[PDB]
Design a protein around this ligand. Structure first.
Ligand code: HEM
Ligand code: HEM
Ligand SMILES: O=C(CCCCCn1ccnc1)N[C@@H](Cc1ccccc1)C(=O)O
Ligand SMILES: O=C(CCCCCn1ccnc1)N[C@@H](Cc1ccccc1)C(=O)O
Lengths: 448, 448
C-alpha cells in the first residue's frame, strides 16, 4: 500500500505551473526520471497519475478495468472535433457507429486502393528535392508536413491541398497553430472567463469558422475513399449511416490526426538516419534492391522490412503522439499497491514507457532498428505508439504504409548530408517535431 | 538467366554418393568453394540448390517469397518429433498454436526464472572441474553436453538427468545417435524396403519407444517451466490448449533441440579461446570484473558483452545448426539470374554464408569477436546461425544466456591449457561438434 510521489508544487496552483513551458512532455519525462514509474499530478479541479513502466502500463491497458479518458488536451480538440472518432467517449453512440463504418476503409486490403494516390504525393516530394540547386538545403519537418497533409487530403477526401506549390503553410494549418497557443495560455489564467479576455476569444472563434468552409468545400464537391464510406456506409449494428453533422466532425478529425503525427515520425526517422550512418547504409541498400521500378508497387512497399524497423525504432524513442489517457471503470488496485477509485484518471507517458530499461536493456537511448528484427520478441504493452485496444489508432496501417513508401523512395533517390551537425530540438504542440532539422540531399540521378 | 553449376555425378545416383561421407557439411563447403554462391544438387527423386552468398541468401530470407521447408534430415527427425515446433510446416495448425503458447516461456521474464536453475547446473560443472586431480584433463564436448542436457531438463521439465553423476551418456542419448546413423545409412539405399534392412528397422522402432517412455517418465511426475506453459497455457488466437499428442512431441522436440546445438557452441567457443590467447585474456578479464559475486546474477550475465561477442564469433565460424531449408511460395527469380518455379527448394549453407568475403573482409577465417561490436554495422541476413523469420530459433535467447553464464564462470574460475595442441576435428551428426577436444584447467581457487 504505497504512497505516491509528487513533483514540486506552486501553492494553490498545485503542479499546474510545471506545464507552463513550451516543452511539457520533455518536462514530464524529466519528472518521471526523478520520481519513477508513477507520480501524482495535481491541478485546481484535476488529479491524474502519470505511468511510465511496462509493469503498470500493461495493467492500465486491461480494457476490462480501464477505458479511454478525454484528457484536457482532447477536451480542447473536442471543441471543434466534436464526437469524431478521436474525441468521443467509448460510450457515446457515435463512436462505435463511426468506428464500425470506418474500419473497412483502413484495412490492409484497403491500403491497395490508396497506394496510387500516396505515390502521387511522394513523387511530388522527390521531384521537389531533385529540382533544388547546389548547396540549397531541405527543411525536413516542413516538407514532411507538406507530404502527409497532401496525402490525407487526396486519399481521404480526393482534395488537393497542393502544399508543394506553397512556400508558406496553408491558412488552415496556420490557424490551428494559433488556436492551440491560445488553448495552452487559457490554463495558466486564474480567471479565464474574465471580461478582459474577449480579445483573446475574438480571434480564437474565427479559426473554428475558418475550417468549416473547407469542409463545405470538400463535401459539396463530392470514388472509393474515406469520404465515400462516410456518406454511403451504414453501421451494421444500428443499420444507420452517419449524420451530416458527425460527417463534418470526422473530416475535421481525419485532417488533423491524419497528417501531423506522421510527418513527425518521418522527420524523426530521417534525423536518426543521418545521425547513425551504419543504419542509413543498411536502409538505403534495402531500398535500392527492393524498389526496382520507377514507381513503387504496393507489394514492394511491404518488402521494405528494414525501413519499417527504422520507423518503429523512431516511434520508440520519440512517439509523436506522446500520451493517452484512461479512467478506472471500477474500484481497483494498480500494481498490487496503488488503490484507485472508480473514475480515477491515468496518463500513459509513451516516451518513458519506451525507455523502460527492464524491457529494452541499458542502451535505451541508442537508435538500433535491430530491436525490431523479430517482432514477436517484444513483450505485451511494451511498445504503444498507436494507443491501446479498441481505442487504438485507426490510421496505423495508413501511417506506416505512407511512411515506409516515402522513406524508401527518399533512401533510393538521394544521399543525405547532416551539413549543419543538427542539434536535436524537439518542438511540442500536441505532438512532437524536430524543430529546425535541415539536411542536404544529393540526387543519385535515378529517373522516375 | 545463368546456368547453375553442379558437382560431379555418379550416373543414375546423380550427386547423392557425394553425401556418402562422415563429414557431409564440410564436403558441401568444399563444393561451395569450387562452384561458388549457388550450385544445384540432385538425388534420385529430389533436386535442391545450396546457397552460399549473402547476396542470394538475403533474397531467400524474404518470407513473402520463401517459407521454411522440411529437409530430408528434418523429415527423419519428424518421424519421432511429429508436428512439434521444429518439424511442422508453417501451415500446420499446431505450429502457430504451439508458437503462440510457447513464446511467453522464452521472454525476459522467463529467462529470469530459469536463471537460478541454470546456475545450479553451472555450479555442478565448476565443482567437477575443481575436483580433478593434477594432470587430469577435461573432455570438453562431453562435459558441455552434460551441462546443456541437464539445463534443458531442469529448466524445461523440472527433471534432473543428473549427467554429472554418470560415466557414460544416458541410454536415451545413445539411442538418439544410433537412430540418426541408421537414417543416414537409409539415405544411400536404392531399395529401402528390401528385407535385408529388417534388422535395421527393428532398432529404429525400439529407440523411438526408448524416447517415448522417457517422455512418460517426465510426464508421470508432473512450477515455472516449459511443461507448465504447455499443460496450462492456451493459445490466444484459438483459445485452445495443446492436446496430449502435441505435448509429447514438444517434449521430444525441446529435449533434442534444447541441448545439442548449445553444447556444440560452448565447445567451439572454448576451442577458439584457447587457440587465440589474446581473446581468451580479454574475455577472462571481463569475466573477472563483472562476476563479482560467488553466483552470477541474471543482470551480470547480460553485462558479459565480450563473452557474448565471443559466442557470436564462434557461431559465425562453426554454426552448430549448419543449414536450413526453404521452398519458393510462387514462381520467382533469384538474383535476377536463376528462375525458380513454385515449390522449388533451397538450402542455406550457413558456414559458407558466414565466410562471404564481400561481407566480412579477407580475414574471414580468423577468430575476431570485435566483428560483433555494432549489430547495425552487419549487413542484413549476413549472420543466420538461428534461422530466419518466424521460423527462427525459439530457444535463441535461452541458448545465449546459458552459454554466456557458463562461459563466464569458466573464465572466472580456471586458467585453461591446450596441452595436446588439439587439431580441430569436426564430428557431424545433424549438428557440429569438435571431436576429441581436451584441455587442462588450473583452478584460480575462487570459492563458490
Ligand atoms: C496517418 C494517418 C493517421 C490517422 C488517419 C489517424 C487517426 C486516428 C484516429 C481517428 C484515432 C482515434 C480512433 C478511435 O479512438 O476510434 C487515432 C488514435 C490514436 N492515434 Fe492516430 N492517426 C494517424 C496516424 C498516427 C500516428 C503516426 C501515430 C503515432 C505516432 C498515431 C497515434 C495515435 C494514438 C496514440 C491514438 C490514441 C489516442 C488516445 O488514446 O487518446 N496516429 N488516430
Ligand atoms: C538452447 C536451447 C534451444 C532450444 C530450446 C531450441 C529450439 C528450437 C525450436 C523449437 C526451433 C523451431 C522453432 C519453430 O520453427 O517455430 C528451433 C529452430 C532453430 N534453431 Fe534452435 N534451439 C536451441 C538452441 C539453438 C542453437 C544454440 C542454435 C544454433 C547454434 C539453434 C539453431 C536453430 C536453427 C538454425 C533453427 C531453424 C531450423 C530450420 O529453419 O529448419 N538453436 N530451435
Ligand atoms: O499530457 C498530456 C499530453 C497528451 C496529448 C495527446 C494528444 N494527442 C493524442 C493523439 N493525438 C494527439 N495532456 C494532459 C496535460 C495536463 C495534465 C494535468 C492537468 C492539465 C493538463 C491533459 O491534456 O490533461
Ligand atoms: O544439408 C542438409 C543438412 C541440414 C541439417 C540441419 C539439421 N538441424 C537444423 C536444426 N537442428 C538440426 N540436409 C539435406 C541433405 C540432402 C540434400 C539433397 C538430397 C538428400 C539429402 C537434407 O536433409 O535434405
Amino acid at each position: 500500500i504505497k504512497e505516491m510521489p509528487q513533483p514540486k508544487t506552486f501553492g494553490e496552483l498545485k503542479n499546474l505551473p510545471l506545464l507552463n513551458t513550451d516543452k511539457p512532455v520533455q518536462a514530464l519525462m524529466k519528472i518521471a526520471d526523478e520520481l519513477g514509474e508513477i507520480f501524482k499530478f495535481e491541478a485546481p479541479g484535476r488529479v491524474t497519475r502519470y505511468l511510465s513502466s511496462q509493469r503498470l502500463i500493461k495493467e492500465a491497458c486491461d480494457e476490462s478495468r480501464f477505458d479511454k479518458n478525454l484528457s484536457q488536451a482532447l477536451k480542447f480538440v473536442r471543441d471543434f472535433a466534436g464526437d469524431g472518432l478521436l474525441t468521443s467517449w467509448t460510450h457515446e453512440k457515435n463512436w462505435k457507429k463511426a468506428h464500425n463504418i470506418l474500419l473497412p476503409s483502413f484495412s490492409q486490403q484497403a491500403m491497395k486502393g490508396y497506394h496510387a494516390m500516396m505515390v502521387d504525393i511522394a513523387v511530388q516530394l522527390v521531384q521537389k528535392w531533385e529540382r533544388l540547386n547546389a548547396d540549397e538545403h531541405i527543411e525536413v519537418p516542413e516538407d514532411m508536413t507538406r507530404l502527409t497533409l497532401d496525402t490525407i487530403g487526396l486519399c481521404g477526401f480526393n482534395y488537393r491541398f497542393n502544399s508543394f506549390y506553397r512556400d508558406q503553410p496553408h491558412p488552415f494549418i496556420t490557424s490551428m497553430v494559433r488556436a492551440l497557443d491560445e488553448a495552452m495560455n487559457k490554463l495558466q489564467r486564474a480567471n479565464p472567463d474574465d471580461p478582459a479576455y474577449d480579445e483573446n476569444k475574438r480571434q480564437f472563434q474565427e479559426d473554428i469558422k475558418v475550417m468549416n468552409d473547407l469542409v463545405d468545400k470538400i463535401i459539396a464537391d463530392r470514388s472509393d475513399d474515406l469520404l465515400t464510406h462516410m456518406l454511403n456506409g451504414k453501421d451494421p449494428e444500428t443499420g444507420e449511416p452517419l449524420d451530416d453533422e458527425n460527417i463534418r466532425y470526422q473530416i475535421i478529425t481525419f485532417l488533423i490526426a491524419g497528417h501531423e503525427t506522421t510527418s513527425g515520425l518521418l522527420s524523426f526517422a530521417l534525423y536518426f538516419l543521418v545521425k547513425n550512418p551504419h543504419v542509413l547504409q543498411k536502409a538505403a541498400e534495402e531500398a535500392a534492391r527492393v524498389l526496382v521500378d520507377p514507381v513503387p508497387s504496393y507489394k514492394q512497399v511491404k518488402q521494405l522490412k528494414y525501413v519499417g524497423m527504422v520507423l518503429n525504432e523512431a516511434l520508440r524513442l520519440w512517439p509523436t503522439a506522446p500520451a493517452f489517457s484512461l479512467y478506472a471503470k471500477e474500484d481497483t488496485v494498480l500494481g498490487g499497491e496503488y488503490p484507485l477509485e472508480k473514475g480515477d484518471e491515468l496518463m500513459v507517458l509513451i516516451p518513458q514507457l519506451h525507455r523502460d530499461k527492464t524491457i529494452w536493456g541499458d542502451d535505451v537511448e541508442e537508435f538500433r532498428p535491430e530491436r525490431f528484427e523479430n517482432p514477436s520478441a517484444i513483450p505485451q504493452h511494451a511498445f504503444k505508439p498507436f494507443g491501446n485496444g479498441q481505442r487504438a489508432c485507426i490510421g496505423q496501417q495508413f501511417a506506416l504504409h505512407e511512411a515506409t513508401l516515402v522513406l524508401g523512395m527518399m533512401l533510393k533517390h538521394f544521399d543525405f548530408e547532416d551539413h549543419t551537425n543538427y542539434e536535436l530540438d524537439i518542438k511540442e504542440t500536441l505532438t512532437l517535431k524536430p524543430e529546425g532539422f535541415v539536411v542536404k540531399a544529393k540526387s543519385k540521378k535515378i529517373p522516375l
